[PDB]
From a paper:
Examining this closed state model, three putative binding sites were revealed, in which Asp, Glu and His residues from the two monomers are brought into close proximity and may bind divalent cations. The central binding site is presumed to be the main site as it displays tight packing and contains two symmetry-related His285 and two Asp249 residues. The other two symmetrical peripheral binding sites contain His264 and Glu289 residues but no designated binding cavity was found. Compared to transcomplementation with the wild-type allele, single point mutations of the histidine residues at the putative central binding site (H285A) or periphery binding sites ([name]) affected neither Cmag values nor the number, size and morphology of the crystals. The D249A, H285A and [name] mutants displayed a minor increase in the number of binding sites compared to the wild-type protein, which may be the result of an increased void volume that allowed the accommodation of additional cations after amino acid substitution to alanine. Since Glu289 is located at the domain surface, it is more likely to have a role in peripheral binding site stabilization and metal ion coordination than the relatively buried His264. Fourth, we confirmed metal coordination by the His264 and His285 residues by ssNMR. To confirm that these observed phenotypic differences are due to true transport function alternations, we also examined the expression levels of all [name] mutants, their ability to stabilize MamB expression, performed MD simulations for dimer stability evaluation and determined their [name] structures. (ii) All mutants exhibited an apo-[name] [name]-like behavior along the MD simulations, and (iii) an absence of structural differences was observed.
One group of metal ion efflux transporters that regulates metal ion homeostasis and can be found in all domains of life is the Cation Diffusion Facilitator (CDF) protein family. One of the most highly conserved and abundant integral MM proteins is the CDF transporter [name]. [name] was recently proposed to function as a magnetosome-directed iron transporter required for iron biomineralization since its deletion abolished magnetite biomineralization and mutation of residues within the conserved TMD metal-binding site resulted in alterations of magnetite crystal size, morphology and even mineral phase. To summarize our results we present an alternative model for the CDF [name] mode of action, in which we propose that upon metal cation binding, the [name] induces conformational changes towards a tighter and more compact fold which allows the activation of iron transport through the TMD.
Numbering used by the authors:
A (entry chain A), B (entry chain A): 213 to 292
Write the structure that this text describes.
């Protein structure tokens, strides 16, 4: 069920270089698939280009570890 | 009606230093009030802190020029 899977999403995101916590994570089942929407924190002094790069990195790492996720949006917000 | 008001939103955003076009703008009436959701473009080499600053700037400039707007979210995406 969901919570197990949410823990796995947060844990996978957090192991990616540049991720400063997961700020928000919304996940829902579309049948047997997961669709999710997430915000990560990032260094405020990172450039927008760097923030985008970490987001794709997170998107790839999470999709790679949790196979049932068929849609994942990752966006970023300054933190710390 | 709406389109007039959307033109005014885009025009106000675009006069703010650091705004590289309006990428997306969703506006709806909640009665006589406007609630809107917008994405601006920004220099990819700006820092996340700078991108946030321009967003607040846009939020303030648009709310100040279009009085019926009672809710406005501004977020940012690298452009050019």
């Amino acid at each position: 069920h969901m919570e197990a899977v949410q823990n796995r999403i947060v844990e996978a995101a957090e192991r990616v270089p540049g991720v400063r916590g997961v700020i928000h994570l919304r996940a829902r089942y579309v049948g047997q698939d997961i669709w999710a929407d997430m915000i990560i924190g990032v260094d405020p002094e990172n450039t927008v280009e760097q923030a985008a790069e970490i987001c794709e990195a997170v998107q790839a790492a999470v999709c790679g570890k949790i196979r049932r996720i068929e849609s994942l949006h990752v966006s970023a917000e300054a933190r710390e």
